[PDB]
Amino acid sequence: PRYELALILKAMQRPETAATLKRTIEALMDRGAIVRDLENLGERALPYRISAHSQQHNRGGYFLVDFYAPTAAVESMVEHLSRDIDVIRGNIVKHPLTQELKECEGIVPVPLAEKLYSTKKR
Amino acid sequence: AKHLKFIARTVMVQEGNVESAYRTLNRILTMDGLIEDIKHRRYYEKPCRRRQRESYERCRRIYNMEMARKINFLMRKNRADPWQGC
Amino acid sequence: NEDLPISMENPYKEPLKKCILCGKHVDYKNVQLLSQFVSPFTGCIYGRHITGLCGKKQKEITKAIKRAQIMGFMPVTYKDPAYLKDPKVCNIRYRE
Amino acid sequence: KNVLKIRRRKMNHHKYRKLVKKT
Amino acid sequence: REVLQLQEEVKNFITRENLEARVEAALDSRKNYNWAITREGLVVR
Amino acid sequence: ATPSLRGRLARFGNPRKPVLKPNKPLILANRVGERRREKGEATCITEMSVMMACWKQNEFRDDACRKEIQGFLDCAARAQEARKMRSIQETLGESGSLLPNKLNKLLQRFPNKPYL
Amino acid sequence: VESFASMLRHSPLTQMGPAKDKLVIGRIFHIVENDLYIDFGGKFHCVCRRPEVDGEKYQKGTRVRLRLLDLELTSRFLGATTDTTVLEANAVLLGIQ
Amino acid sequence: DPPPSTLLKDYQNVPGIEKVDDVVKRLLSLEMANKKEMLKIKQEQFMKKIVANPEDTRSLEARIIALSVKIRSYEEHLEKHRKDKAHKRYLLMSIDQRKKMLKNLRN
Amino acid sequence: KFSIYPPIPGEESSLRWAGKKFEEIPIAHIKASHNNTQIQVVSASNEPLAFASCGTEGFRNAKKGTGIAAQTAGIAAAARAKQKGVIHIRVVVKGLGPGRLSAMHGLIMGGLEVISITDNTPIPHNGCRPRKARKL
RNA sequence: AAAACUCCAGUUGACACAAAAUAGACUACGAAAGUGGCUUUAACAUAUCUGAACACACAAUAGCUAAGACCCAAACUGGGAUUAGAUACCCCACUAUGCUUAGCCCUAAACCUCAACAGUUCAACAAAACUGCUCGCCAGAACACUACGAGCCACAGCUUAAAACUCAAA
Ligand SMILES: [Mg+2]
Ligand SMILES: [Mg+2]
Ligand SMILES: [Mg+2]
Ligand SMILES: [Mg+2]
Ligand SMILES: [Mg+2]
Ligand SMILES: [Mg+2]
Ligand SMILES: [Mg+2]
Ligand SMILES: [Mg+2]
Ligand SMILES: [Mg+2]
Ligand SMILES: [Mg+2]
Ligand SMILES: [Mg+2]
Ligand SMILES: [Mg+2]
Ligand SMILES: [Mg+2]
Ligand SMILES: [Zn+2]
After folding, report:
1. What is the residue range of C44's domain?
2. Shortest CA distance to I43 belongs to which of I105, I102, I3, I86?
3. Under CATH, which number does the domain A2-94 receive?
4. Separation of F42 CA from ligand 3 center, angstroms?
5. Where are the domains of chain I?
6. Interface probe, candidates G1, G3, G21, chain C, greatest C C-beta count within 10 A
7. What is the dihedral of CA I68, I70, I71, I74, to 10 degrees?
8. Quick one: a GO cellular component term (chain I)?
9. Smallest CA–C1' separation from H97, nucleotide
10. Is beta strand A34-52 parallel, antiparallel or unpaired with respect to A55-68?
11. Burial class for H71, CB neighbours closer than 10 Å (0-12, 13-18, 19+)
């Protein structure tokens, strides 16, 4: 199934960032993935101090690996990302563009519920 | 503890109305329901009691919105007597 | 007999109301929209009565917000001050 | 409903458990 | 249509021979996923 | 917009567990609850505290600190007439809305109809 | 003779459509202090506050224009079996003539 | 066990298959898919093997084949997750339902 | 014109307090428990400047958790901060005790100028399980 | 209040095998028990219906066996208060236990006290009254969630379950 890997990497320079992206992608292709695209959301400050691999990170570089993988490779990829020390946070999810949008007619009005109690005197 | 320190639940005082700013902050916490969360988490509410309290609050909410709707619907009829001498 | 009423589906029927995101795609990386539906001071997710969202869109907003907060896209405890300037959509009045 | 039958059974069971513990 | 549409998109996939050029191109490029909604059902980018 | 009541109650034909368990039937009464009384205030504490600090720092001498002794006396007075004015204001009219008895008169003119 | 269905068809109350945002002229028939009781036709009368601007040409018999937000103003509440009517329609007074 | 390079059920009728790239063949193959597609392939292979018309899916035999492949899937699931009581119950009830329709087909 | 939102650190901000920006004004932490109120004044780089509480100021057992006790503790903490050279201050309050606004008033009457109010009360997202209910 | 702690408290920084604010004014999933932090994998029986107390599979909490984890809560217990007494309510400390792995135990006001399927529009309180069909169960109170027999990894256990004496009611 088609997956998306959200990758927060360390705030590094261009050669080290390229080397880390290269390592992650060739890892994916050795585990058995065919990679669709690499996207760069860019370097930005983290929402909170993420502590990973005995370092306290304040900023990070956000990337996406949109790819396609067999079923039993996600676990191996997660273990490899956990062992990598330049990945601040890596997450593999099913693809939002593979889940399809359903057409909506609109919000249906709900009435007031009737006949909840008997019509006795009480 | 890992977030930025001076952003969440922070209000600024304007010309020195520190009492007004404290009222504003208390209003923030009341509208977000943080204060009642603190009062209910001072002691442990067992899950059956939590469920009884939430069901009771929901029934009270339903009744109070219906009652307020009726009141606002009848305040227009709350006028002076149109035909006084019957 | 020519002037008797006849059976049809209701004309003058207004089309059903649609939520602001209805037909839109909610993504967990869209932390400007998710920040819009997150409360400015305490980071609380708003309810249906505040957001005005339909049930499915409220569910997607909740799931995307929780996903982004645990994946490190959104702060939990506060709204982003960089996104505290967006078009306000939630029917909440804190100041007075 | 009141709990008078529950009370009868409750005291029955209490005294039975005390008897078993004693013997 | 699905197979045919899938066919021409494969030409832009990342391979071993496209890897370093595609990584450098991604490092030069930047995609922004953020957009906002208004009171009306309209998108502000 | 009130919360719905569609499948919220344990009735016949409902395939769900009950969402709500009301001890009172959800029917609007023809009455409004009475206006609750305000609680304890314990006013004048700040002025009492500053007078009372002056006393501890000056061995309890008015002829030193007449000024905040007078401030405490004014705050006590203003609290007493404030109590008078809030009592008369509550007997006069409720702020924004109306009194519970007049609301009750409206509801006796338009009773709820839980029967046929 | 003309049948009641034909009457209802060639009646203005049916040609009006829904009352919402329809401009209708009507007469004042009763006044209490500054609560003008206006008829606009149909089953019920509406009650409008006297506009303070030009507030002296609003007397018994005056022709006014109305927007007619509603035609009967009923609503069902929490325990009720039928709805609570107020025997009065909803309209906003816009002016004279 | 169908081979992982087997093409999907819904994709095995398109004219252009032998000329597309091997990455496309891998992409539409069963290795890069899930167990529901694997079970669909196994079920239709069984239908081609056993019944007269594989386009019926409304008969006793077709329903018994469907429950048999679901029973196989439940057995694999329990072999990995021994402590799944819900799926153990589903397996036992599927066995009983298959026995019921087997009795009906025998009679 | 005015914003109740505090200034963001790494941006331009025309708001000033005796020339100092928002990010280096000293901070007073008021822990307002149900039985005590503790005020500690620190600088922005976490140098303690003043520390006062109800037990420090003399109230012994149950008079500690009152408004007047927190006012006294706030007055004394503000006096020590004025000795240490503090004028403007950012208040961070933790707890829902009786002496919260009273301790803030004590700082004000002592002579400090409050520029921002923060509530850092610990609210778990269901962490530790609290005490059992009192059968009172 | 006392006891307790002062190897204590406040700010900041590192930091979980525990528990999952808001969303939840939502009404969902599951056979029932139950299920509300995030991701991925597997996965939610039956193309008539009812139907096993001679079976098979489950079944909250508490508990048992063995090996670990330990923030917090906490039976028991100890101390302080209270009281005529206080084996309690109130305060403090701490354990079994709540957690994980494997095996038992098989119980609940397990109650929405309202059986499944199909369909229709009055005793009293409660949640309006019914029809067709099938299964399960009930027949004065108390003895009795008992005795005995039997079965069970249960051995202070669970299920099934009487009688004598008594009453003119419950
Ligand atoms: Mg009741
Ligand atoms: Mg002592
Ligand atoms: Mg059956
Ligand atoms: Mg059974
Ligand atoms: Mg403890
Ligand atoms: Mg322990
Ligand atoms: Mg856990
Ligand atoms: Mg059990
Ligand atoms: Mg239950
Ligand atoms: Mg029962
Ligand atoms: Mg049955
Ligand atoms: Mg028992
Ligand atoms: Mg027995
Ligand atoms: Zn919608």
Report:
1. 1-96
2. I86
3. 3.30.70.60
4. 72
5. 1-136
6. G3
7. 160
8. mitochondrion
9. J46
10. antiparallel
11. middle
